[PDB]
Amino acid sequence: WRYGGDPPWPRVSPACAGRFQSPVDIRPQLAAFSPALRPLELLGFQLPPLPELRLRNNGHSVQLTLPPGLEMALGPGREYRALQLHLHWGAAGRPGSEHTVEGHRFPAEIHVVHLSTAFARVDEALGRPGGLAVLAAFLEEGPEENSAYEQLLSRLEEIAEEGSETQVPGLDISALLPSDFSRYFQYEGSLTTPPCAQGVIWTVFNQTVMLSAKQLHTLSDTLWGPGDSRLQLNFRATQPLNGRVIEASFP
C-alpha cells in the first residue's frame, strides 16, 4: 500500500472501507463535554540513554520503536503500554497533519500507539474495542528548537533511504507530547493506514507541540519513500464522523 495511488486500500484490507474510520475533522462546537474524562497519566516515559531505540524510515513514516515499561492510562481501569511512535507531515508550504480542526490542517502530527494491557500482542487487539489507543498531537512552528524532537530530527539524514534504520539513545518520550494532558478530544475510530482496524481509541490534545521552522523543513525534506519519490504528504484523507460524537474533556 501507498499514499496517493494504487492499490485501493479496501483491496489490501476491507476494514479500510468501514463506516468508522480515522482521521476525522474535529468540530469543537459539535463535541460533547464529558466530565468523566480525566487527565491522561504516563509512567516510565523518561528513558535512560541505554538501551538505544530503533528509528526507522519504513517508506510511509519515520517510526521510533519504544521499549517495554511505558505505561499509559486514559483513566482508572483503562490501562495501556506504549509500542511505538511516528509522524505525519506535509511538504514545503503545505500542511500534513491527519486530523484537522474546523477544516484547518496543521503542519504535522505525532502518533503514540499503545496496546491494551488485556492483550499480549497487537494482532490480538486489532479490531477489538479499545484494544489499541493512539495519543495524537499537532505540531506547529514556534521560535525555538525543540530539543526532544531534535534528538530524532538530527538523525533523519542517516535514514533518508526507504527501509533504512538507525539506533538512538533513549530520551524523555513525554517531552514529544504537549505539557497539557488535561484538555483533549477523544473518539473511537481506526488505524489511519492498512489494515485500518476499527476499535481504536483516539485522544487528540488541545495544546500543540512547537517545532522550529528548520525542524519542520528537516522533517518534510529529508526522507525518501517508495519509488524515487520524497516521503511527504503522508496523511490519509479526512474520514466522516458518520454519527460518532467526539468527546471533550473541557466545556
Q: Which is nearer to Zn ion, 111 or 114 (CB)?
A: 111
Helix-strand-coil percent breakdown of the chain, rounded to 5? 15, 35, 50
Instruction: Tell me which of ligand 82E, Zn ion, none is bound by residue 123, counting a contact when its beta carbon lies within the kind-specific cut-off of 5 to 8 angstroms.
Output: ligand 82E
Question: Catalytic pick from 60, 104, 114, 217?
Answer: 60
Instruction: Tell me which of Zn ion, ligand 82E, none is bound by residue 37, counting a contact when its beta carbon lies within the kind-specific cut-off of 5 to 8 angstroms.
Output: none
Beta bridge partner(s), residue 186: 203, 247
Q: Which is nearer to ligand 82E, 61 or 222 (CB)?
A: 61
Site membership for ligand 82E, residue 192 (CB under 6 A): yes
Q: Which three cell numbers stand for residue 169?
A: 539513545
Between the alpha carbon of residue 137 and those of residues 56, 90, 176, 185, 205, the distances in Å are: 20, 15, 9, 11, 5
Q: Which three cell numbers stand for residue 220?
A: 518534510
Confirm whether 104 is a catalytic residue: no
Site membership for ligand 82E, residue 123 (CB under 6 A): yes
Was 99 annotated as part of a binding site? no
What lies within 8 Å, CB to CB, of 191 at 6+ separation is 22, 126, 132, 197, 200
Sole binder of ligand 82E in the list 111, 185, 199, 241 (CB under 6 A): 111
Residues in binding site for substrate: 192-193
Q: Tell me which residues touch ligand 82E (CB under 6 A).
A: 111, 113, 122-123, 134, 191-193
